[PDB]
Design an enzyme around this catalytic site. Sequence first.
Site, PDB file in Angstrom:
ATOM      1  N   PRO B   1       0.855  -1.185   0.000  1.00  0.00           N
ATOM      2  CA  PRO B   1       0.000   0.000   0.000  1.00  0.00           C
ATOM      3  C   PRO B   1       0.867   1.201   0.000  1.00  0.00           C
ATOM      4  O   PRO B   1       1.861   1.286   0.725  1.00  0.00           O
ATOM      5  CB  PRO B   1      -0.833  -0.084   1.266  1.00  0.00           C
ATOM      6  CG  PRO B   1      -0.474  -1.318   1.939  1.00  0.00           C
ATOM      7  CD  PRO B   1       0.710  -1.988   1.197  1.00  0.00           C
ATOM      8  N   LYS B  32      -1.406  -5.691   6.746  1.00  0.00           N
ATOM      9  CA  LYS B  32      -0.143  -6.016   6.118  1.00  0.00           C
ATOM     10  C   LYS B  32       1.009  -5.580   6.999  1.00  0.00           C
ATOM     11  O   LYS B  32       0.880  -4.643   7.789  1.00  0.00           O
ATOM     12  CB  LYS B  32      -0.011  -5.296   4.775  1.00  0.00           C
ATOM     13  CG  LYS B  32      -1.135  -5.641   3.832  1.00  0.00           C
ATOM     14  CD  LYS B  32      -0.907  -5.136   2.427  1.00  0.00           C
ATOM     15  CE  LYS B  32      -2.083  -5.505   1.531  1.00  0.00           C
ATOM     16  NZ  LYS B  32      -2.189  -6.974   1.353  1.00  0.00           N
ATOM     17  N   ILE B  64      -2.208  -3.548  -3.972  1.00  0.00           N
ATOM     18  CA  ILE B  64      -2.501  -4.768  -4.711  1.00  0.00           C
ATOM     19  C   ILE B  64      -3.548  -5.493  -3.878  1.00  0.00           C
ATOM     20  O   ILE B  64      -3.229  -6.094  -2.856  1.00  0.00           O
ATOM     21  CB  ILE B  64      -1.259  -5.632  -4.917  1.00  0.00           C
ATOM     22  CG1 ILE B  64      -0.169  -4.881  -5.675  1.00  0.00           C
ATOM     23  CG2 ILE B  64      -1.641  -6.908  -5.660  1.00  0.00           C
ATOM     24  CD1 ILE B  64       1.200  -5.536  -5.571  1.00  0.00           C
ATOM     25  N   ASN B  97      -8.518   9.043  -3.814  1.00  0.00           N
ATOM     26  CA  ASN B  97      -8.725   8.079  -4.883  1.00  0.00           C
ATOM     27  C   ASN B  97      -8.110   6.745  -4.494  1.00  0.00           C
ATOM     28  O   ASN B  97      -6.956   6.692  -4.061  1.00  0.00           O
ATOM     29  CB  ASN B  97      -8.123   8.567  -6.200  1.00  0.00           C
ATOM     30  CG  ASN B  97      -8.927   9.677  -6.828  1.00  0.00           C
ATOM     31  OD1 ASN B  97     -10.060   9.919  -6.450  1.00  0.00           O
ATOM     32  ND2 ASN B  97      -8.358  10.330  -7.809  1.00  0.00           N
TER      33      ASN B  97
HETATM   34  C1  LIG Z   1       1.446  -1.644  -1.212  1.00  0.00           C
HETATM   35  S1  LIG Z   1       1.039  -1.195  -2.692  1.00  0.00           S
HETATM   36  N1  LIG Z   1       2.413  -2.627  -0.816  1.00  0.00           N
HETATM   37  C2  LIG Z   1       2.995  -3.504  -1.721  1.00  0.00           C
HETATM   38  C3  LIG Z   1       2.193  -4.759  -1.757  1.00  0.00           C
HETATM   39  C4  LIG Z   1       2.802  -5.951  -2.110  1.00  0.00           C
HETATM   40  C5  LIG Z   1       2.044  -7.103  -2.172  1.00  0.00           C
HETATM   41  C6  LIG Z   1       0.632  -7.058  -1.912  1.00  0.00           C
HETATM   42  N2  LIG Z   1      -0.160  -8.171  -1.996  1.00  0.00           N
HETATM   43  S2  LIG Z   1       0.365  -9.618  -2.501  1.00  0.00           S
HETATM   44  C7  LIG Z   1      -0.979 -10.614  -2.164  1.00  0.00           C
HETATM   45  O1  LIG Z   1       1.560  -9.984  -1.796  1.00  0.00           O
HETATM   46  O2  LIG Z   1       0.637  -9.601  -3.920  1.00  0.00           O
HETATM   47  C8  LIG Z   1       0.003  -5.866  -1.583  1.00  0.00           C
HETATM   48  C9  LIG Z   1       0.783  -4.713  -1.489  1.00  0.00           C
END
Ligand SMILES: *C(=S)NCc1ccc(NS(C)(=O)=O)cc1
Lengths: 114, 114, 114
Positions: B1, B32, B64, B97
């Site tokens: 994030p 996270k 993500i 957003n």
């Molecule tokens: C925010 S955009 N942090 C980076 C990040 C990396 C991975 C994930 N999810 S996953 C399931 O590991 O792909 C989310 C955010």
Amino acid sequence: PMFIVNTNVPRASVPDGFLSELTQQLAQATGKPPQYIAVHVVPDQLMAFGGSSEPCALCSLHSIGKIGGAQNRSYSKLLCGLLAERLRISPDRVYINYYDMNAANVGWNNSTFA
Amino acid sequence: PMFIVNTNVPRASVPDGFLSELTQQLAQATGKPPQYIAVHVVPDQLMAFGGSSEPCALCSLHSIGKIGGAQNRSYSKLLCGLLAERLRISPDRVYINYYDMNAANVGWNNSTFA
Amino acid sequence: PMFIVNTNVPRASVPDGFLSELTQQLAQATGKPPQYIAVHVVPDQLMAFGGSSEPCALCSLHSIGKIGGAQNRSYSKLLCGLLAERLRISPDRVYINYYDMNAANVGWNNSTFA
Ligand SMILES: *C(=S)NCc1ccc(NS(C)(=O)=O)cc1
Ligand SMILES: *C(=S)NCc1ccc(NS(C)(=O)=O)cc1
Ligand SMILES: *C(=S)NCc1ccc(NS(C)(=O)=O)cc1
């Protein structure tokens, strides 16, 4: 292609030629002529990555096409390499968001690319 | 994030510890580890909201996954609450957003998350 | 609607009233009341366009609706005209990205719009 880097490293640490290097290397990587490429570097930012204010960067590459799984891995290797060698930023403190733009959603010179 | 806030409030009004707080609050809100969270605060901006230059903010939250209807309502209360309490920005002068990124479209550490 | 302009033009060359003019012109062009419109202008940036650092701009227009092929062409004429007249930027040195936002992905005043 449009490449933006936001970073907490100081403006004085950005080496001469850096914008030009980004332009040249992005032309090589995307295959678009340098005339099509825009670059924007924003130093001295208030930022943290992983809870640390050590050098880091948040970046985005927008492109009409030329975005995809393998291509984005190649861009990340290229761009992290430049940020490390030129801005002294560790690759594990860089995020790059990749955006495949529809041509109808990119304006330029009183029109769009649709 | 990745959380970005652009605001017209002055730099001196951003409290010590604000980036750390944003990191910790977002880690809890997204579930996270804090090592994954990046934050960027941009004060002193030339901005208008509704035609007025009273304190305001334009923000983005990229992740993500963990982006969606119900989650975004919760994030909006959290983030407007932080901007109100810490920067004295009225929640009705904040836009945020929310962007759900594909793993293949986020670069990190010379590659992508795909 | 949210309109952001990043430019290498210096702050002193941004005319007083520019934010108000953008707000009013975007209200007319999008059909949304000025109360709904946010504007953000970022001068003094380190930018290149086509490898050159003559005046340029990278802009974004986000909107809940009112984005599409024909509308975006009209916005590009409006916005390139304003940037040319007010900031003295050549229209061939302007890119504008258009983003149609889902209301559930826009936070405001402690929740989202859908
Ligand atoms: C925010 S955009 N942090 C980076 C990040 C990396 C991975 C994930 N999810 S996953 C399931 O590991 O792909 C989310 C955010
Ligand atoms: C980076 S986002 N450059 C803009 C750009 C403009 C045109 C094209 N080619 S076309 C007209 O879509 O075929 C690619 C990239
Ligand atoms: C530009 S992005 N303005 C924000 C905005 C907020 C609401 C609406 N209308 S609705 C029916 O509440 O979603 C339009 C634009």
